[PDB]
């Protein structure tokens, strides 16, 4: 319970973190016509 | 050529067999949770007290349903609007006998539908098309989050959620029309002409384009917004019909001049409204 | 008083029409501009100071 | 006329405004007329509710909800929600159409006589989207505007008259609040408390005293990002994480307001302190609450309970699923684990008793003023999130440069390698 | 002059307009 | 025995979608 | 109820809530002068 | 009948309600008035019909 | 429930599946 | 040249709408049915067959006007204006629900005349008739409907009377004594319904983002983009407007059998496995069950008015209830 | 143009006219055998109007008449 | 009783609209 609680809050905290910066590492440079 | 951009080139890369994308990397973990999920609840769950009243309803194949019949039942009525995560409950046979994987399906699943609508614009984006295939698509995503979310949360509960079967969608459809009168709703009406007349010209699109092949633009431009405006049109139906805002009433209408009452169709609709509430409604 | 209050602001909803019905005219077409914009501004003005009696004239 | 038509703008009819985007005077003729009319609406409703008001009649039965925003911040009110006078009503209306009729003429004044474009009147009033400074500094000052309004009322509860509190003894009483609250850890117990049922995020607040130092909290905060956005330049990964153009900021403001309306529907429709059940009527919690009392008295009188989840005192059947809801008219008849039966065998004063029937009958024929606002709030916000998706996609794909079709001749598509 | 189209015309607006008629005097009824 | 031919006939379905999307001939 | 002084407009309040609606419908009539160009 | 079946009830009629072996006689029903009243007949819409036994006049005696 | 539901199950999901199979794999041994 | 030839260049010459030979039997028969409907709702009630005020005369709505059904009695007599019934009395004949017969057949005939008027037509521009061959579909729903349905049960009176009201009483109808939710012809239905409303939608949506800046689209891009965000994708042209054309179509069929074997009782009313199981123990309870539960209480609340004719009596203690 | 105006003057509001007195003088309830809204049901005749033999029709109205 | 001032409005639209049609 208690690992799978950490894991599951781990796991939100890092897929979000990864889609944040993601978003803002400059991702208007990926179209085709850049 | 740094790792953080060597991952980032990875994912936002059209070269994979299906597309990732920053939304994708939500979608894939919400989705997959909610299909095993419900696979799992489907074959074999315990019973779930759906009526907060210690007496259970089962749902799963293990327990004597079929696929027709089988359905994964709404969280407790006890619960209310509570989140019930399983580290929040006090035994795993209790959570479940509460309803908690309907909640983690549905959870799941309305995080991934946003999140796939997200991901369908950003492909169409890296390719360099026009981005308005999510605009579309927003139309069956509203009506999912009217009966899943805005539903109960206008009701107060997930127990009044449409339940994940076959035959729970229209003990539904059946409850939802005893409690407010959906058929004589406009908004439905407008969503049913937008289904029906979806189909009418998608068969009369396809026949000529068929027929012929052996502003035009327009027309597909036309093609797309009908069903799609009638279906933002009825999920906004259901979603004040959430709010207690039901639709018209002409019962008991016409009265004789002396002063009786003389019946019409109304009236048989609603006596047949009736009928299925009172079977509704377990105790008063 | 009352009845003076009232005529007051029987001419101020007159008047408001006539700037409702003036000032889009005056504005969008500045062809006659020399009465015009007297006109319109001097609406506005009479506008504002009738606004300010009827002020005090409630109480 | 030049410039009014398709060829020279490439926009149709149905798409007109579009070609405002680069006519600086005129949009912001536009905006004004446009704050002119919103403003218009609310001086007029006002007017009318108030020429249809009835005193005898509850408003929620009456049928007003532009009356019960007003009789929420007292204007006119008295203890447990009677009406004294609908004079300040009035006052307000008048108020807010005199200022419609200037924002109007400001409005005609900016789309017709005066400049069409402010970059050759001035510099400071002339502006092109893509200048990232001046953007962030028109944002910071409209920014400080919104501070001052937010500091104006809590000013108006601390000094001016302050607010229905429904939560003074014997029903609701309007109050001036004098203890706000400012510990910082009570802010972030309600920001980061759960949107679930576990709680409610910022819906759950119940006490006045919250709700005043939240606003002051907001208006500084406010104030002083105004400052900040005047004073600083974008930093670079910001200048990189956005798009730089007029319809990009439609988007982004479109994302906000609906995020907005989804809160404001919450607020509506689960809080009872904010928006007083003595006005919009109860909610569905407190009417579901309110007919299981009415019965227990009926049945008490005539010679029903049970254990939560958690094993406190609720009521019982469907009312279950608000075992945990809070109301004035309840709560004293709490306990440290749910309501005594003892008590409510004793405790129910005249005033709650009559309230609990009040609402058993007004349960959200009849529509309550929380269910219109809910409903249209609703739809709008739904709405507003669709236009969001629509000017952000269009946003990024004008930016990028294929907005107006795919290219015939350098496709795109034609030169990725098949996946097969 | 008289044409098909004529035919259709009046097959259709004579009635129409009579029912329009009888529609509204339904109306002012008590 | 239901369930099994339930389930069977379901992960033939899901066999079916694998097969289908990665090993299409592909488009020309 | 209107302020006893103003009771006399009563009728032209009774017509503003609904005047939002006309500037839309007012568009299309402008559209409609200039033969929607 | 042949409008009492079902789509996917298979097989022959005596696979239902069974083989019929005896007729066991026309039944009358009396109440405690001794008045005879008489059950009505179910129609062929109804899979289930609620007993009523009324009285050949047309009112309900018992049920 | 019926001895015979199972085997009509059966034939109904195989018949129609080997009459594909063996369509499909007579066209692709052909060039 | 004789007369039959000058007929049938003056059928096919151009003018403002095509006549063709179909136009003889669709215009008179299409205008007669409209007609009757419009009679039917402005003036003719029927207090006399289902004892209700379904006209305007009455005082009803645009939502409850119905050119009702005849009565019960009538069994399935034609009931002609000069038949053993009407006998000649106009007034008898809408009395009796003459009315309804008059549409739904001239209706029949006019459907008839509207898909021979599409083999004309593509027989006079000269390309594939494929939009009759769609428009069978609507023939199919029409006939199992207003005909066959009435036909398999006791009366016309248990048809479909034409109206709103109405037609969602027959819905609750139909799903309280035929239970038609949980037919498996009916789910094929709804499938093709949705499905192809779901085709029209996004076909239209790719077809306007794929658009070329100047057939118009670019079928590459959108291959590819369904591919990689949904998994399939149509590579061929012809294949996609056809399945846009085949399965709305395909599911009125499913549903034009669902409706047939319904109007003879022959319908999927019960899983027995499961009312076995619930005989046996009292606490098993599924989704199912409530369903069975809902569609008793709605034959019990709706069979006393809905067929006034049987002169129902149900009282109180027999009506089901959640006690 | 304008020579059906006139036509068209002279005759639809005397259509219209025509429908409305069809209405007003109550043939219509003759014409259609609709009730009168005192016909529905006499001071107590609160039974319903309903055919019970489908070969007497008419006649059996003739007696509810 | 108020058709006369819903009226009034309407012509004061229209008329709006119409003297800027003039020029
Ligand atoms: C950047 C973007 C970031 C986005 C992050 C998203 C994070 C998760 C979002 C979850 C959204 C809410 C889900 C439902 C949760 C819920 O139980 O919601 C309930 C809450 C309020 O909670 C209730 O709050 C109540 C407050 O009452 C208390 O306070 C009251 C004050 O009067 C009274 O005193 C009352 O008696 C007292 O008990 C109670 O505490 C209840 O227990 C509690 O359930 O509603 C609310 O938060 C109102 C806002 C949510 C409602 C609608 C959400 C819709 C989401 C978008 C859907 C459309 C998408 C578009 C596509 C189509
Ligand atoms: C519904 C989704 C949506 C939202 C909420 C939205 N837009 Mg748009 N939007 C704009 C501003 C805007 C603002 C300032 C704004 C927020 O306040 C919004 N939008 C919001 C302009 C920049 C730009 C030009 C708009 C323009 O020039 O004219 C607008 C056009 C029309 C016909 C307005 C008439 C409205 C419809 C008849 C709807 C009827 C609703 C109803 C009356 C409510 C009452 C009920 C009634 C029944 C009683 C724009 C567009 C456009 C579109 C589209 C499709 C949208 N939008 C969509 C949205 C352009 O093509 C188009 C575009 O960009 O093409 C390039
Ligand atoms: C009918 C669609 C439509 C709507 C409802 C609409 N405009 Mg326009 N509209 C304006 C204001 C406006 C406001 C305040 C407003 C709010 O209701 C609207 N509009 C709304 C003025 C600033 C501006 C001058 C009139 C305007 C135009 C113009 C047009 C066109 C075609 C439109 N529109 C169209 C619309 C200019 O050429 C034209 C234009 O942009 O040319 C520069
Ligand atoms: C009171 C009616 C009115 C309104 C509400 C209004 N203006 Mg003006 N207004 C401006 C901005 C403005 C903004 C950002 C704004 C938003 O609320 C408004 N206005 C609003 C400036 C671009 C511009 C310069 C004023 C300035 O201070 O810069 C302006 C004018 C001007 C006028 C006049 C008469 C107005 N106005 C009038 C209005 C100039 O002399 C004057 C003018 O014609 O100079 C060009
Ligand atoms: C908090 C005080 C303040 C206010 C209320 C405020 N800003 Mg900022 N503000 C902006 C918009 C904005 C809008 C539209 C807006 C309206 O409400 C505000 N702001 C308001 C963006 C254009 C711009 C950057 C984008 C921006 O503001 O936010 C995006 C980036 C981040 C990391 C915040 C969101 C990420 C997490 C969910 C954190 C949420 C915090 C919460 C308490 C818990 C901006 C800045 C920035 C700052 C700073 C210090 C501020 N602000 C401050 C404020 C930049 O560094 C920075 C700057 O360099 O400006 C020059
Ligand atoms: C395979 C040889 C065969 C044929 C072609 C055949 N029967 Mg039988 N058959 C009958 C009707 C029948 C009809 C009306 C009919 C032609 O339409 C046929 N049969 C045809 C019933 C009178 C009688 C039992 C009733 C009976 O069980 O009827 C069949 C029941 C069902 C649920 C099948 C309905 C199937 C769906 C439509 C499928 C469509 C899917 C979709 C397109 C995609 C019968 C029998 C029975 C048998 C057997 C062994 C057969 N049959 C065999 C056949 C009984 O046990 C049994 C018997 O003789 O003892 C009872
Ligand atoms: C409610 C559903 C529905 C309606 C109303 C409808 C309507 C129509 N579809 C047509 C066509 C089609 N429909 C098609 C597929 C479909 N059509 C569907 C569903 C519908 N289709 C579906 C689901 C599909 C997908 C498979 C095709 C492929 C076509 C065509 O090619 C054709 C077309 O070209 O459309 C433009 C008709 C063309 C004119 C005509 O011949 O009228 C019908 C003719 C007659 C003679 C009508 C007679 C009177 C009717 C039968 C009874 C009386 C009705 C009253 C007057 C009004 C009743 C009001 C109600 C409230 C009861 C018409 C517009
Ligand atoms: C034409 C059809 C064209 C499409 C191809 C066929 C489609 C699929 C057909 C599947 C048939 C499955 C049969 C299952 C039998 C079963 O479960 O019990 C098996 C049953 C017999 O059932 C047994 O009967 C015994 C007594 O004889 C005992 O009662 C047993 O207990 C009982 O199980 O088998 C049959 O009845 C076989 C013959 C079936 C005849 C069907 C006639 C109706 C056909 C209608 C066609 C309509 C098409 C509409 C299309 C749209
Ligand atoms: C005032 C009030 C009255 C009642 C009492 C109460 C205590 C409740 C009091 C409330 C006080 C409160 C709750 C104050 C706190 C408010 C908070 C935490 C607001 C936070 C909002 C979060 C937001 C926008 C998220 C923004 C993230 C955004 C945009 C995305 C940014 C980025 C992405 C990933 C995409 C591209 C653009 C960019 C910038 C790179
Ligand atoms: C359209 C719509 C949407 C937007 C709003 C708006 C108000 C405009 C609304 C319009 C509403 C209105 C007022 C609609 C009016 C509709 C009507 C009544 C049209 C009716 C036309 C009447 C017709 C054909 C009747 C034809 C009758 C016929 C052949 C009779 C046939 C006969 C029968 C039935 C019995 C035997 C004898 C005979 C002669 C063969
Ligand atoms: C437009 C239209 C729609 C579909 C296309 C179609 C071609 C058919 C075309 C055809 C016809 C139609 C519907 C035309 C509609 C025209 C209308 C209603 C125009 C009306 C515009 C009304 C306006 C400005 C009113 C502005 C009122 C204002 C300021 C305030 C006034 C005042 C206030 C409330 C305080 C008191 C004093 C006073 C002066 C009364
Ligand atoms: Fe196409």
Redesign the pocket.
């Known amino acids: 319970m208690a690992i799978l609680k950490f894991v599951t809050y781990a796991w939100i905290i890092f897929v979000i973190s990864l889609f944040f910066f993601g978003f803002i590492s400059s991702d208007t440079t990926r179209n085709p016509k850049a | 050529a740094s790792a953080w951009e060597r991952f980032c080139s990875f994912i936002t890369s059209t070269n994979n067999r299906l597309y990732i994308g920053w939304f994708g990397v939500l979608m894939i973990p919400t989705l997959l949770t909610a299909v095993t999920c419900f696979v799992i609840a489907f074959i074999g769950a315990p019973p779930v007290d759906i009526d907060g009243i210690r007496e259970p309803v089962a749902g799963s194949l293990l327990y004597g349903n079929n696929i027709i019949t089988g359905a994964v039942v709404p969280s407790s009525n006890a619960i209310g609007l509570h989140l019930y995560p399983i580290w929040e409950a006090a035994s795993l046979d209790e959570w479940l006998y509460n309803g908690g994987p309907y909640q983690l399906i549905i959870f799941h699943y309305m995080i991934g539908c946003i999140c796939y609508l997200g991901r369908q614009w950003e492909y169409s984006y890296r390719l360099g098309m026009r981005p308005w295939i999510c605009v579309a698509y927003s139309a069956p995503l509203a009506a999912t989050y009217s009966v899943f979310l805005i539903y109960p949360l206008g009701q107060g509960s997930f127990s009044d959620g449409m339940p994940l079967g076959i035959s729970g969608t229209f003990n539904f459809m059946f409850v939802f029309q005893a409690e407010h009168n959906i058929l004589m709703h406009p908004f439905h009406m407008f969503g049913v002409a937008g289904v029906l007349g979806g189909s009418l010209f998608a068969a009369m699109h396809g026949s000529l384009v068929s027929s012929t092949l052996v502003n035009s633009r327009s027309l597909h431009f036309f093609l797309g917004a009908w069903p799609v405006v009638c279906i933002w049109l009825t999920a906004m139906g259901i979603s004040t019909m959430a709010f207690n805002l039901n639709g018209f009433n002409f019962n008991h209408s016409i009265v004789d001049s002396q002063g009786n009452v003389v019946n019409t169709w109304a009236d048989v609709l609603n006596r047949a409204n009736l009928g299925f509430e009172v079977m509704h409604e377990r105790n008063a | 008083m009352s009845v003076l209050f009232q005529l007051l602001i029987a001419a101020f909803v007159a008047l408001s029409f006539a700037m409702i019905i003036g000032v889009p005219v005056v504005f969008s077409t500045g062809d006659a501009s020399d009465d015009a914009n007297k006109l319109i501004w001097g609406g506005a003005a009479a506008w504002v100071v009738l606004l300010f009696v009827a002020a005090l004239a409630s109480i | 006329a030049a410039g009014y038509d398709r060829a020279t703008t490439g926009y149709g009819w149905w798409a007109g405004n579009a070609r405002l985007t680069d006519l600086s005077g005129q949009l912001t003729g536009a905006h004004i007329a446009h704050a002119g009319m919103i403003t218009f609406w609310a001086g007029a409703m006002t007017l009318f509710e108030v020429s249809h008001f009835i005193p005898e009649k509850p408003m929620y039965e009456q049928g007003s909800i532009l009356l019960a925003h007003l009789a929420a911040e007292g204007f006119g009110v008295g203890p447990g929600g009677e009406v004294i006078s609908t004079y300040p009503y009035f006052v307000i209306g008048a108020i807010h159409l005199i200022a419609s009729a200037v924002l109007g003429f400001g409005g005609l004044y900016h789309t017709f006589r005066g400049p069409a474009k402010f970059e050759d009147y001035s510099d400071w009033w002339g502006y092109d989207w893509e200048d990232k400074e001046k953007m962030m500094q028109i944002l910071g000052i409209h920014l400080i505007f919104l501070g001052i309004g937010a500091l104006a009322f809590a000013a108006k509860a601390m000094f001016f008259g302050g607010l229905y509190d429904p939560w003074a003894p014997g029903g609701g009483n309007v109050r001036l609040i004098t203890n706000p609250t400012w510990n910082l850890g009570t802010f972030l117990g309600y920001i980061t408390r759960s949107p679930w049922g576990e709680g409610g995020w910022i819906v759950s607040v119940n006490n006045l005293e919250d709700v005043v130092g939240g606003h002051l909290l907001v208006g500084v905060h406010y104030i002083f990002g105004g400052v900040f956005h005047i004073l600083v330049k974008p930093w670079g990964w910001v200048r990189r994480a956005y798009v730089w153009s007029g319809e990009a900021y439609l988007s982004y403001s479109l994302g906000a307001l609906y995020m907005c309306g989804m809160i404001a529907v919450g607020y509506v429709w689960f809080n009872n302190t904010v928006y007083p059940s003595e006005f919009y009527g109860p909610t569905a919690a407190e009417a579901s609450q309110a007919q299981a009392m009415t019965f227990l008295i009926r049945d008490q009188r005539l010679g029903y309970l049970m254990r939560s989840p958690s094993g406190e005192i609720i009521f019982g059947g469907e009312t279950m699923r608000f075992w945990d809801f809070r109301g004035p008219w309840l709560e004293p008849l709490r306990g440290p684990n749910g309501l005594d039966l003892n008590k409510l065998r004793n405790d129910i004063q005249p005033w709650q008793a009559r309230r609990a029937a009040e609402y058993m009958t007004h349960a959200p024929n009849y529509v309550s003023p929380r269910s219109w606002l809910s409903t249209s709030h609703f739809c709008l916000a739904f709405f507003f999130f669709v236009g969001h998706i629509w000017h952000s996609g269009r946003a990024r794909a004008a930016a990028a440069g294929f907005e107006k079709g795919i290219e015939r001749k350098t496709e795109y598509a034609l030169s990725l390698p098949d996946i097969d | 002059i008289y044409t098909v189209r004529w035919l259709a015309v009046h097959?259709?607006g004579v009635?129409?307009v009579?029912?329009?008629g009888?529609?509204a005097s339904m109306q002012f009824i008590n | 025995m239901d369930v099994i031919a339930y389930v069977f006939i379901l992960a033939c379905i899901i066999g079916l979608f694998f097969f289908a999307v990665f090993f299409r001939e592909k488009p020309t | 109820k209107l302020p006893e002084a103003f009771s006399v407009f009563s009728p032209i309040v009774d017509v503003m809530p609904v005047i939002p609606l006309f500037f839309l419908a007012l568009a299309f009539v402008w559209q409609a002068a200039v033969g929607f160009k | 009948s042949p409008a009492k079946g079902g789509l996917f009830r298979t097989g022959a009629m005596n696979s239902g309600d069974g083989i019929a072996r005896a007729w066991e006689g026309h039944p009358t029903f009396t109440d405690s008035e001794g008045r005879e009243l008489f059950v009505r007949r179910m129609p062929n819409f109804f899979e289930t019909f609620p007993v009523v036994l009324t009285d050949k006049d047309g009112v309900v005696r018992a049920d | 429930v019926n001895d015979l539901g199972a085997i009509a199950t059966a034939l109904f999901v195989f018949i129609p599946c080997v009459f594909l199979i063996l369509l499909y794999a007579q066209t692709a041994s052909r060039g | 040249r004789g007369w039959f030839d000058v007929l049938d260049d003056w059928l096919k010459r151009d003018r403002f709408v095509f006549i063709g030979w179909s136009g003889i039997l669709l215009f008179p028969c299409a205008?007669?049915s409209?007609?009757?409907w419009?009679?039917?709702?402005?003036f003719v009630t029927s207090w006399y067959t289902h004892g209700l005020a379904s006209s305007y005369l009455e005082g009803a709505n645009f939502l409850t006007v119905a050119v009702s059904t005849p009565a019960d009695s009538l069994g399935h007599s034609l009931l002609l204006?000069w038949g053993p019934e009407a006998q000649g009395d106009?007034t008898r004949?809408?009395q009796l629900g003459?009315?309804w017969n008059?549409?739904t057949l001239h209706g029949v005939f006019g459907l008839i005349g509207f898909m021979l008027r599409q083999f004309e037509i593509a027989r006079l521009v000269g390309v594939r008739p494929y939009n009759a061959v769609a428009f069978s579909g609507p023939i199919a729903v029409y006939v199992s409907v207003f005909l066959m349905y009435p036909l398999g049960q006791s009366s016309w009176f248990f048809a479909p009377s034409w109206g709103v009201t109405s037609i969602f009483r027959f819905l609750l109808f139909a799903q309280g004594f035929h239970n038609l939710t949980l037919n498996p012809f009916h789910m094929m239905g709804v499938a093709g319904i949705l499905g192809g409303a779901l085709l029209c939608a996004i076909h239209g949506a790719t077809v306007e983002n794929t658009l070329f800046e100047d057939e118009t689209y670019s079928m590459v891009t959108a291959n590819r983009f369904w591919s990689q965000i949904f998994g399939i994708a149509f590579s061929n042209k012809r294949w996609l407007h056809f399945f846009m054309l085949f399965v709305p179509v395909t599911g009125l069929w499913a549903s034009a059998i669902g409706l047939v074997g319904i109007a003879l009782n022959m319908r999927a009313y019960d899983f027995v496995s499961q009312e076995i199981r619930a005989a046996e123990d009292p606490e098993f309870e599924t989704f199912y069950t409530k369903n069975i539960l809902l569609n008793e209480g709605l034959r019990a609340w709706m069979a006393p008015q809905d067929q006034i004719h049987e002169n129902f009596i149900f009282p109180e203690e027999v009506l089901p209830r959640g006690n | 143009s304008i020579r059906y105006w006139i036509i068209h003057t002279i005759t639809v509001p005397m259509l219209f006219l025509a429908g409305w007195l069809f209405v007003s003088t109550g043939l219509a309830y003759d014409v259609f055998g609709t009730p009168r809204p005192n016909e529905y049901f006499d001071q107590a005749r609160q039974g319903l109007p309903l055919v019970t033999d489908r070969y007497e029709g008419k006649q059996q109205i003739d007696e509810f008449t | 009783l108020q058709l006369t001032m819903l009226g009034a409005v309407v012509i004061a639209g229209p008329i709006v609209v119409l003297l800027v049609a003039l020029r």
């Open positions: 097959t259709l009635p129409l009579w029912f329009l009888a529609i | 205008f007669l409209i007609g009757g419009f009679t039917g709702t402005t204006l106009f004949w809408c003459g009315l008059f549409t």
